[PDB]
Write a protein that binds this DNA or RNA. Sequence first.
RNA 1: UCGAAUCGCCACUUCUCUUAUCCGGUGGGCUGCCCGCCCGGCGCCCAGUACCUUCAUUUUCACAAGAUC
RNA 2: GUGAGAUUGUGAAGGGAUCUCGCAGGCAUCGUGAGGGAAGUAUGGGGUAGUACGAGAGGAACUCCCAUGCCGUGCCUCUGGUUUCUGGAGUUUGUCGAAGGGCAAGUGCUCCGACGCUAUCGCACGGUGGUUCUCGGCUGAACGCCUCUAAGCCAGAAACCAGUCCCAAGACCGGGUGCCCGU
RNA 3: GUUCAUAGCGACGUCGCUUUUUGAUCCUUCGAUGUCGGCUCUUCCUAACCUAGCGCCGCAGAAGACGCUAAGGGUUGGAUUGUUCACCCACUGACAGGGAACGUGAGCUGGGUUUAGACCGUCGUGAGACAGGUUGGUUUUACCCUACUUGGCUGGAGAUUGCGAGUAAAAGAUUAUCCGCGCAAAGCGGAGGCAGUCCGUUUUUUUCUGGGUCUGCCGUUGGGUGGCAUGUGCUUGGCGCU
RNA 4: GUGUAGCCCUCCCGAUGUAGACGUGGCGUGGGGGUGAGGACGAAGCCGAUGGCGCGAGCCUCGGAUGGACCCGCCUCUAGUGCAGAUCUUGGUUGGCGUAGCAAAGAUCUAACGGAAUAUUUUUAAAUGCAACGUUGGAUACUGGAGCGGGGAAGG
RNA 5: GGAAUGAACCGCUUAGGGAUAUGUGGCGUCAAAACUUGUGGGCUCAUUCUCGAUACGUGAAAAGGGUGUUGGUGGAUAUCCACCGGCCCCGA
RNA 6: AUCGAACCACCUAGUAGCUGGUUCACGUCGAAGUUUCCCUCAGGAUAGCUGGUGCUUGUCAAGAAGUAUUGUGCGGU
RNA 7: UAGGAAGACCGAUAGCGAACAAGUAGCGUGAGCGAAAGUUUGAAAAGUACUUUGGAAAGAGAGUGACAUAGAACCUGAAAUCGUGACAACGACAAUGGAAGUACCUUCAUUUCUCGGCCAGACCCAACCUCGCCGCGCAAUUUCCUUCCG
Lengths: 221, 396
Amino acid sequence: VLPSRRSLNRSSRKGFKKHRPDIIVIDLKDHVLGRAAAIVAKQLLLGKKITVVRCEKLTIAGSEIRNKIKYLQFLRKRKLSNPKLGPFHHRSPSDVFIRTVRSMLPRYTKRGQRALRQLVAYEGVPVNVVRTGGRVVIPKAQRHNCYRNERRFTVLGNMCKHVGWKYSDVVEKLEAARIEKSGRHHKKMEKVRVAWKNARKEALKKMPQKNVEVLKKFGLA
Amino acid sequence: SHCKFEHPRHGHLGFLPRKRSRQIRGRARSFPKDDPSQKPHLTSFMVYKAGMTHIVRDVDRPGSKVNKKEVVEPVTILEAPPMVVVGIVGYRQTPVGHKTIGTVWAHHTSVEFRRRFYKNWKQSAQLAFTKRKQFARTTEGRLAEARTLKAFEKKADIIRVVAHTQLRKLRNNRVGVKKAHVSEIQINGGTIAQKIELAKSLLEKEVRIDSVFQQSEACDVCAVTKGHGFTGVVKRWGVACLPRKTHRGLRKVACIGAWHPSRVMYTVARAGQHGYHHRTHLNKKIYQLGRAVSMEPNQATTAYDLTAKTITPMGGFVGYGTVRNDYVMLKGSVAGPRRRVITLRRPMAPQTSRKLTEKITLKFIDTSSKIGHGRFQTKKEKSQWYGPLKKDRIRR
RNA sequence: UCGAAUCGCCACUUCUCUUAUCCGGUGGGCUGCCCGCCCGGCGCCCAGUACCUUCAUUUUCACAAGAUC
RNA sequence: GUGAGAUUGUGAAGGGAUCUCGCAGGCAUCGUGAGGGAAGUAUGGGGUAGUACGAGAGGAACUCCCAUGCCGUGCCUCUGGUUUCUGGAGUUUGUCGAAGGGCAAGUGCUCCGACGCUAUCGCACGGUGGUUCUCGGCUGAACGCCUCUAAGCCAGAAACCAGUCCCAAGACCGGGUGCCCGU
RNA sequence: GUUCAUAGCGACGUCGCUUUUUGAUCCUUCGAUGUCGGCUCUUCCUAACCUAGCGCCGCAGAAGACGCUAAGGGUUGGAUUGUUCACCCACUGACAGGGAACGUGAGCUGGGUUUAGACCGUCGUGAGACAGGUUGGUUUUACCCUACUUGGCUGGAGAUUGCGAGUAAAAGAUUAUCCGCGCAAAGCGGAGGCAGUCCGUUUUUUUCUGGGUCUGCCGUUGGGUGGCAUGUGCUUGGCGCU
RNA sequence: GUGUAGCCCUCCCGAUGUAGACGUGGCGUGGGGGUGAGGACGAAGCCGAUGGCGCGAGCCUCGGAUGGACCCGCCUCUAGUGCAGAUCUUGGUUGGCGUAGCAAAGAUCUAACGGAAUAUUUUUAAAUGCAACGUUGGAUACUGGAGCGGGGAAGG
RNA sequence: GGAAUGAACCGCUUAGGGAUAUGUGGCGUCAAAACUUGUGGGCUCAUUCUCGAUACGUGAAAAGGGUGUUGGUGGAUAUCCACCGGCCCCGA
RNA sequence: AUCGAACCACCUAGUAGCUGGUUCACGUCGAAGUUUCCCUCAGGAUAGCUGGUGCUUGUCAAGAAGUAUUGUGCGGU
RNA sequence: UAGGAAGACCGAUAGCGAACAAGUAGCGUGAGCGAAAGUUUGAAAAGUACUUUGGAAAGAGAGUGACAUAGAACCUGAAAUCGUGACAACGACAAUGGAAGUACCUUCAUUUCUCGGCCAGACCCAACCUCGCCGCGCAAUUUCCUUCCG
Ligand SMILES: [Mg+2]
Ligand SMILES: [Mg+2]
Ligand SMILES: [Mg+2]
Ligand SMILES: [Mg+2]
Ligand SMILES: [Mg+2]
Ligand SMILES: [Mg+2]
Ligand SMILES: [Mg+2]
Ligand SMILES: [Mg+2]
Ligand SMILES: [Mg+2]
Ligand SMILES: [Mg+2]
Ligand SMILES: [Mg+2]
Ligand SMILES: [Mg+2]
Ligand SMILES: [Mg+2]
Ligand SMILES: [Mg+2]
Ligand SMILES: [Mg+2]
Ligand SMILES: [Mg+2]
Ligand SMILES: [Mg+2]
Ligand SMILES: [Mg+2]
Ligand SMILES: [Mg+2]
Ligand SMILES: [Mg+2]
Ligand SMILES: [Mg+2]
Ligand SMILES: [Mg+2]
Ligand SMILES: [Mg+2]
Ligand SMILES: [Mg+2]
Ligand SMILES: [Mg+2]
Ligand SMILES: [Mg+2]
Ligand SMILES: [Mg+2]
Ligand SMILES: [Mg+2]
Ligand SMILES: [Mg+2]
Ligand SMILES: [Mg+2]
Ligand SMILES: [Mg+2]
Ligand SMILES: [Mg+2]
Ligand SMILES: [Mg+2]
Ligand code: NA
Ligand code: NA
Ligand code: NA
Ligand code: NA
Ligand code: NA
């Protein structure tokens, strides 16, 4: 994915500087794992580019002990003759989500393999996607719309930590820094936000009165 | 049907595959856990194997049958010329592992270090590090170095130093390699700022083994074992031989699997490469830390044996020669043949047992010849047994 | 060298938390009702809501014959 | 566009047209670690102690200390085994005239024998944290009593997961660094 | 079971599980799937013999009985017999039960079973018979594909193509138009000058050029101070040189 | 005017199928009787990213930088008349494959000569002509008189 | 054409092709259809062969139990007893 | 190189209810594994199921019907 | 033993075993068994003198002949299998196959070139098939609606 010299010369000759394709960034905090994967799988097949973040905050219905036992039963399956050929049991939350999505795709055709290549999964919000725009959610897979309040659920990050994931503390430290850095900057840049709101209110007093009457009729000001 | 009688399986399945080691030098895969309370210090060293001998000492072990009595213990002698520190590296932690941040190089480096980056040094242009030398000390070069050191302080997690051996000072006739061996040594203890301060003071300087290890301490050994080439199942795995009347040979495994599954499994012994594997062994006590013979010649003289002698046996170590530099005496054996490069590291397992904390006081060191049955400790002793010989008569 | 498919962008979006929750926050009076108080944006044809000015013969659809990289 | 080539079935110049390939990396080092493998396990003695308990008869165990069995990873200082160093010596038959030096008997045979390889027949070494099961409890309703359970919490098996250990980027590392080349 | 149905048992009855016994059937194989046992080697199951932790007793202690989680580890040396099975001697913490084409013959062995020679008993007029006893009786082929064990060579992200552009990177005239400190702050620091040329839609325009020059710095001429493990490179301090 | 390149135009009802039966102005091959053509300005045969026609068996055209002397359409007669397999017959070719191997009877060395078998380079000597053969002299060693000694029979 | 898979089950039975509509079976992704339909009711929480979920297909299960939770019937008193169902749990 | 009956040529292409094979296209139709007899049970003959050729006729229906209704008989699950 | 007539016969794996130095070569102690093989170059040997490399075999030229890719067991010269030049791409589903398109070739067939038998779009008539909008009949709408009191 690192550009070669050939790409650099071609871009320099034609005067191309930067390019960003159309990508949707999904915040997967407090989303149901199975329902989020099913919706994402169909959109990938329709030709969308999707990047998901905060995969460690996905939720699964049931107690943690029940889901932990479920994973351990999966870990027991291996090719006895040569386990290095057998099924591979990935342990990170982003790898678990990618495996779940892969099971909902035609993975043994070129069309299915291409669709899987269009998905990128992260733990937390990495520095290269922080400033890329506003994140989105999936209302049909949100926890407060799917589970009854009295049921018990499992957070994917806590489940993975006890079956082999080794970077739970690293992700937690990185998230704390990001919240501090983003919170400071958003406390800044408030004077400009207030100034812009004040300018709009100062308008409707200098702008033509006929256009003000139209705005009132349509309920805009 | 079940097997008629039970016995434990042959061999350890955690040391697979039994393939040739990728490198010939011993490399530590992990370093001891960092303790920020202690002072910054190095954690490993590189030495060369010379040979073996044995010693006599008195043991202090209450409740034992040998308490306050003499024992004989074989030991291993390893030559340890001082190392040179040339670089600093820093690491940062990411959700996918550790990543290198950058490298700070020393301004002056020796020819033996720069020999490592060439296949034919004497017939090349020898241009390595020439451009960096022209730029490092300028105003822009100083600014670039400060930028890298600022990155180390701000966001690094682990600090390591790049060091190399001095084969020129180890004037061995049988070790043919002239390019130095390069490795990384982690710095443990103190904060990140204190770690960097120690590394800068160490740049372009020598480090002696006595400043890393102490006598009566334990250590870990990383080395590659002796090779044996293609080997049968009897030697490779230790299976039992078959009766004498066996058609088509008896040094085999009779049954290599059942009908189902219809394939051979990875747990069955087969013939292949044996030896030349990387191994890490634990808890080797340090019996002596000797200094170079040029400074103090009475290396093998103890408080109970006043004979003046060096550590090299009569006639020299077989296939190695003389020990001319600092050395370390380890109890027991270490992997690999003579002349191989071996890495010693600080212990990983807890060190609190009575055996591990015992204080060692040597009483006798053997220096007889390892060729034949040596019966003279020194050259003077042999010339006292024999009188003047025929050749001496010619001289006088 | 290359003729190519893609056709919103922002240094107001590009911080956080909740849903048994003051749906912007936050008090008082007598369960629940009543009464208070303070505070996404642009973009679609004049760089701006005036009514000034060039568009053709590419003469009835055809990948926008134009843009971006 | 440019640099190379090709257009091979009934002959030779010359021109044209078209079709293919190249137009950017190379070598050398220090590292990361997803995934896979996975290992240590038992007994005895000292002391507790002739103690607890028991009318007597009899009769235990934990911290701690010292060894050993089975297994695993290595090594050759010592001891033992092995000799085509045909090393040194000795000895039989034949043979070069004798002696000397040898030689033939697919290594004549005997003794000692280095280097190397090798034996529990010799020697060294074999770690750290969590989640839980059975079970025992704490608060506590349902059910103005009670209750280890309904919500919640504690401690916790040779079991399970990770660390240490072995292979390791078809796990395609936008990890670092050195020099040459190109833009 | 001194009493006491249920510590431990449990008749008369009744409900199940398993495929490690033997039967019942005859679906596949008769232009052939090598038929007992032992040796060797790996793995799986739990209905737990020993090893870890527990509950309960007709558990005072010691030794034990019953039950729960648990298959990580261990489970022997011999006499007789072809034996599986059986039965004794001995050690031990313990000498648990089973599966994998009744695991395993192009891995072995060939004692037994089941050809041809021969002896005995019983049966048959006889040739001969006996799931009765006995002795002697050729064990063939891998260089192919896969699996497994080691051993090397080498491409490749549109997983060989597209030019089909997503960094677990930075932080701004849209990353361009310099650096250092600082919180994506507030704020505060440093920066050589002169002449041409060659190109140019403006803001002290881009380059290329020339001397005059001043730091940091190379390679140097020699000189003396010194450190390092002491033949080889450094730190000094000047000289004239980019 | 059963059956076609169906005499032509409307309308209605059925259409699969093992063993098996039957139909076809249904296809193809060797030869006889008739009729009509073709060929050195090139017959049969053979080759094909040569297309066209037919549901199909097949038919026809094109090209040959192939060939060198015969052959076909239509109506009828006649038969040794159509192939993918029979552990089918006879030839040819084939992966395995430069593979498995060419391992009893002890063994050869050296100089000169001979030989086309060298001392073979244009683009100092070694790193660019290797390997192997016979005779003679010398060396080493085997057969060891029940001999890789010297003569005969049978057989040749 | 359906029941993932199957000679015999379900639907339907077949000249070469379009348009329209159905049968059996379905409408979270694989995979066409409720881009997870209703402005419809209830019931269920199930720790190592892991609650349950398309008949034929026994092609996985009993006797006997539960103060789990949700409904009935018959008696008593200003809540108590006896009996019978649904789903789930032990037996496994 | 042959022996619980040698070798060569011939009768001999010996017989086989048993195993193997059996060469172009389209179209109209399209089954049976059941009955009786057979030294019959891995085979035949015989009736049934099928194809071909028709004959005699009719055209809304004769000697039509795997179906009802009405009337009248039979029966021992 | 001499001759004649022929054939809806076979046409070199056929026809006699034998179209040829065939009951021959070869096999078996013997009685006996028993093949393969068209010399079919060309009308005519005119069967390649001579130069050059090579020890030779042969190669490169030259020549005869209408043709030598008719060069000597030489007419025609198929398939199986192999080499070479150019090109097409291609992961690992063993290949092969069916259906429907597309990207590059091919220049095979047919049509057209001032009218076209080519490619699109809109409009008109008939037929068939949909959607909007507006409604009706019936004691179905009295186990009902409303007011007041008990
Ligand atoms: Mg066992
Ligand atoms: Mg044998
Ligand atoms: Mg020695
Ligand atoms: Mg792991
Ligand atoms: Mg594992
Ligand atoms: Mg000798
Ligand atoms: Mg001799
Ligand atoms: Mg000896
Ligand atoms: Mg068979
Ligand atoms: Mg067989
Ligand atoms: Mg077999
Ligand atoms: Mg069985
Ligand atoms: Mg068996
Ligand atoms: Mg066998
Ligand atoms: Mg056997
Ligand atoms: Mg076998
Ligand atoms: Mg016998
Ligand atoms: Mg039909
Ligand atoms: Mg048929
Ligand atoms: Mg004929
Ligand atoms: Mg025939
Ligand atoms: Mg044929
Ligand atoms: Mg070979
Ligand atoms: Mg051999
Ligand atoms: Mg001899
Ligand atoms: Mg001799
Ligand atoms: Mg769909
Ligand atoms: Mg016949
Ligand atoms: Mg047949
Ligand atoms: Mg029909
Ligand atoms: Mg009869
Ligand atoms: Mg013939
Ligand atoms: Mg020819
Ligand atoms: Na044998
Ligand atoms: Na159990
Ligand atoms: Na002789
Ligand atoms: Na049959
Ligand atoms: Na013949």
